[PDB]
């Protein structure tokens, strides 16, 4: 019943070419979890724990939560971890999906493992995203930093384009978080 019920740990090492043996896909820049591509059997240097399977969602690297980050950030975390690499993953299916916007829509019970992971994934997405809003600029705010200040029409285009990972209203104004860029 729980989103995190099938989370497992796979301990791997770098293959003889220094790589992981699988490509990382998704990332917040596609509105997605980081998740694994095709796991070629024999390209992963397994160490302990459980095996990796294709298209599982990558949650943590050496106990650093990475879901909600770009692929840039995820690989940057990987690069600063010495072997062995402890990966926490979950297979997609049922309630578990790589789509970040839909995962942020889910209503979990406050205090649940599911809820705590959702807030962790929000903070990560917030690290490199600047929110957008239709309210007017207030004194002291830096456009492009505290907010992107856009009109209602522009906010509706971003929403209709699927650019927003999260949307809401407060005192008759629009707030949202756009997908981060690849830079």
């Amino acid at each position: 019943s729980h989103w995190t019920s099938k989370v497992h740990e796979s301990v791997i090492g770098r293959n003889p070419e220094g790589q992981l043996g699988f490509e990382l896909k998704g990332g917040a820049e596609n509105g997605q979890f980081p998740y694994l591509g095709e796991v070629k059997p024999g390209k992963v240097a397994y160490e302990s724990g459980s095996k990796l399977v294709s298209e599982e969602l990558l949650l943590e690297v050496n106990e650093t939560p990475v879901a909600g980050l770009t692929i840039r950030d995820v690989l940057a975390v990987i690069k600063h971890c010495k072997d062995p690499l402890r990966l926490k993953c979950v297979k997609q299916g049922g309630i578990v999906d790589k789509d970040l916007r839909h995962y942020l829509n889910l209503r979990f019970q406050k205090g649940s493992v599911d809820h705590e992971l959702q807030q962790i994934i929000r903070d990560n997405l917030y690290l490199r995203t600047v929110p957008c809003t239709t309210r007017p600029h207030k004194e002291g705010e830096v456009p492009g930093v505290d907010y992107i200040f856009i009109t209602v029409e522009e906010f509706m285009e971003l929403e209709k384009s699927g650019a927003l990972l999260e949307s809401g209203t407060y005192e008759d104004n629009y707030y949202g978080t756009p997908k981060p860029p690849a830079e």
Binding site: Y126, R135, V145, G168, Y170, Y174, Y175
Partner: peptide
């Protein structure tokens, strides 16, 4: 960076 109270309410 971190979101204000207003943004957090809007969600």
């Amino acid at each position: 960076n971190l979101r204000n109270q207003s943004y957090r309410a809007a969600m």
